[PDB]
């Protein structure tokens, strides 16, 4: 019936949305995390220098 | 005819039997939405 | 019987564990894949083990598009279920009557193909390991078994050498006769556990010979050898570099190919993993990348995971 | 000049003995890093 | 015709059982040899 | 004359750089690839730039298996030579008579196909930019031109807006009349240079309209729409995240395909890079990984690179 | 219900205008991380 | 047949030159328009 | 002649060995470099704590 | 075969010409093997 069609359409759109979101976000997550780690390391270097 | 009746119910219901038993053994016993959600939001 | 205990013999490993330390630890055959893969598994309980898993994949033949799974492992019972898109259902149940005797049942239905289930019964005594596997057991109207039967026995001759057999009986329909096959297994563990040799001579004529060496606490190396008239052979050498940040596995093949598998643990939870392979006799490549996001379900377990 | 299955089994056997001699030798001990 | 394969299979199984028993008792013969050593 | 200088115009960039900010700087069309790719470039002299480069690749159709190249660049001259396996030499020579007038010649052999060359003459005045390019010039026995020529002009009507044209004449053989096509070009720059807009109508009926925005000092974004009876259109929206350690470019398309490209500089010399694209209209993926190794040629530059 | 080339031209133009509004809007400013 | 093609190519080039000249003179006309308003 | 065949064979084998070496080395080199950096930072933390 | 000589020269000598220019304008002036080597052996 229409219930099965709605279910499969919703599942497929959820799957594609999740794949796009994580594929575009995980590189962002790791690059931004590395940048933040470097910034904090630099800040503690300044703190220990002064 | 018993096996034919079991064919669909066992198919659809092997997974949430395990889910229910783990939930019963789980200390805090979260709800169904938390159980299926991959987020750590608890 | 008293003189049996007087020999201080040790229990040999299971037959499935005969060459686990090479074909699973050092080599990347079971870990390799292709295309992109994301694994999203979370742990709800530890002391009674209970955890779920979502798996998204794309571009890989072996893996499906989406697969959900959930497992529970208590002190003696182990249950696992897996539901896959197109609604394929797999289930595993291991029940331990005792630390030595264990029963297992594996069920798999593809929803359009005959259900395939296998019954496992294993017993690991103080000196010998025996097990029996039944694939699609069935009895004819005359009372004759129909299916696949495997019965394997491994006995430790000396605390540094174990020798054993594996017999298999096949009865496809009952009208056609059931074939029988016998294979020989041998395993030599070093006196200091530094290196291991393992050789199997199967009933079809093929021979498998593997050697494993623990170079250091962080490095392992191994050679595996397969050879099946029509006779063809292969020799694969490999190494595993295990650290407290990342793991690396690299193998050369005698068929002129090279492989690499590097799992890089960027975060305590998030862990990226890359794998590549170059085939020189054909000049092709195979690339796979993916992530594992191991999360939690309880706040205290969040604290434990984060430290 | 044979070019027979015996030849490929002999080549494979040479591969196995060379590999086991390599691993058991201190060559791979030197190959692994000290750290 | 199939009968020949039947008895070939049963002798194969009997031989497998025989070597299994021999392997089961093997540590005693090895102990005798090391006693001789 | 005097009033022309009193207007106080500025020189707009050449026609080739009209979509520089949104097509090359932000979008990953030029940087994307497939399979594995290793680049190993070393530099000998810096003030007169001189460097060599080796490139290995496997799994990509566009890229060759092995390629070598060298380039030299003094104050007013630029030269580059390239050699590829199957021996297809390429060569580019740009001589700058002044800082404004540049004559450049590009040549590429194919070793089995007709060698193709192009010649460009570029003039950049105080308030307009002209360039004339020819591809495979040839003269018939009657002295008439036979080839492809493109002459483009861009004049800045106001300090924020530039309008221009390009005219292309193609004469394939001379027996068949050559065809002419005129294209219109528009560019707008915000007063604070916050955003750029560009729009060009092509001779083939294609319309390109692209907007670029500088969100912050480390990120920027762009959106581009192209249109081409048979009418087909597409629109891509992308973003760039530049950092001192990594560079990211992401892109959604109206065709349904998404793409990401991350170049991560692990070391001052090494720089790995990954690119991944997923198309949901056929559920397929492309993965590509590679490394860039930058090296010095003399001790002074070697210590300069590290610090 | 037209399903014509005008339909795809209109959809592409609407998508372009919506993207321009989104990019010019402050929403895409907060989308950029502050650091 | 091709004569009309040559004429239309020639007139396209002619209008291209015309609009190029108009574009070159355009900044002054815009300045005068601004002066008027 | 034989010179061209020898050159082609040598170049092809050099290419194969070089690509194998770098494919099996670059992941190893980056992993071991990250481990060495982590060990150095841990040693620095230990010495500043002591 | 002067025509074929120049034809093959225009192919085999364009890269050496660039290398010659770079070597002449550089200060260290290394040997050909180091010029063609991707190693940092300097
Ligand atoms: C449908 C759902 C799809 C899910 C898709 C999910 C995509 C996630 C993929 C993320 C991959 C990001 C790649 C990258 O650049 O990450 C680098 C990563 C970790 O590096 P770190 O940031 O920890 O480095 C710190 C200093 N060592 O390093 C690594 O992990 C190692 C990568 C090494 C690459 C080496 C390439 C080999 C060169 C081959 C050359 C062959 C030439 C013929």
Residue numbers in the entry:
A (entry chain J), I (entry chain B): 86 to 135
B (entry chain E), J (entry chain M): 19 to 60
C (entry chain F), F (entry chain I): 49 to 276, 295 to 373
D (entry chain D), G (entry chain L): 27 to 61
E (entry chain C), H (entry chain K): 13 to 49
From the paper:
As the main entry gate of mitochondria, the TOM complex is responsible for transferring ~90% of mitochondrial proteins from the cytosol into the mitochondria. Mitochondrial proteins are primarily synthesized within the cytosolic ribosome and subsequently transferred to specific mitochondrial compartments through the corresponding translocase complexes, including the translocase of the outer mitochondrial membrane (TOM) and the translocase of the inner mitochondrial membrane (TIM23). The TOM complex consisted of two Tom40 pores, which were surrounded by two copies of three small Tom subunits and tethered by two Tom22 molecules. To investigate the transfer process of preproteins from cytosol to the mitochondrial matrix, we captured the TOM–TIM23 supercomplex by translocating Jac1sfGFP to isolated yeast mitochondria to obtain TOM–TIM23–Jac1sfGFP supercomplex.
Notably, the density of the TIM23 complex was progressively diminished with the contour level value increasing from 0.08 to 0.16, implying the instability of the TIM23 complex. Numerous efforts were made including substrate screening and modification, large-scale image collection, and chemical crosslinking to enhance stability of the TIM23 complex to generate a high-resolution map, but no obvious improvements were achieved for the TIM23 map. In the architecture of the TOM–TIM23–Jac1sfGFP supercomplex, the structural features of the TOM complex were significantly clearer than those of the TIM23 complex. The densities corresponding to Jac1 polypeptides and sfGFP were observed within the Tom40 channel and on the cytosolic side of the Tom40, respectively. Moreover, structural analysis of the Jac1sfGFP-engaged TOM complex revealed two preproteins proximity sites (PPS) on the mitochondrial surface. The PPS1 corresponded to the N-terminus of Tom5 (residues 1–26), while the PPS2 encompassed the loop between β-strands 14 and 15 of Tom40. The PPS1 and PPS2 were situated on the cytosolic side of the TOM complex, potentially functioning in recognizing the incoming preproteins. Superposition analysis of the free TOM complex and Jac1sfGFP-engaged TOM complex showed that Tom5 exhibited an ~3-Å movement towards the Tom40 channel in the Jac1sfGFP-engaged TOM complex, suggesting that the Tom5 might respond to the incoming substrates.
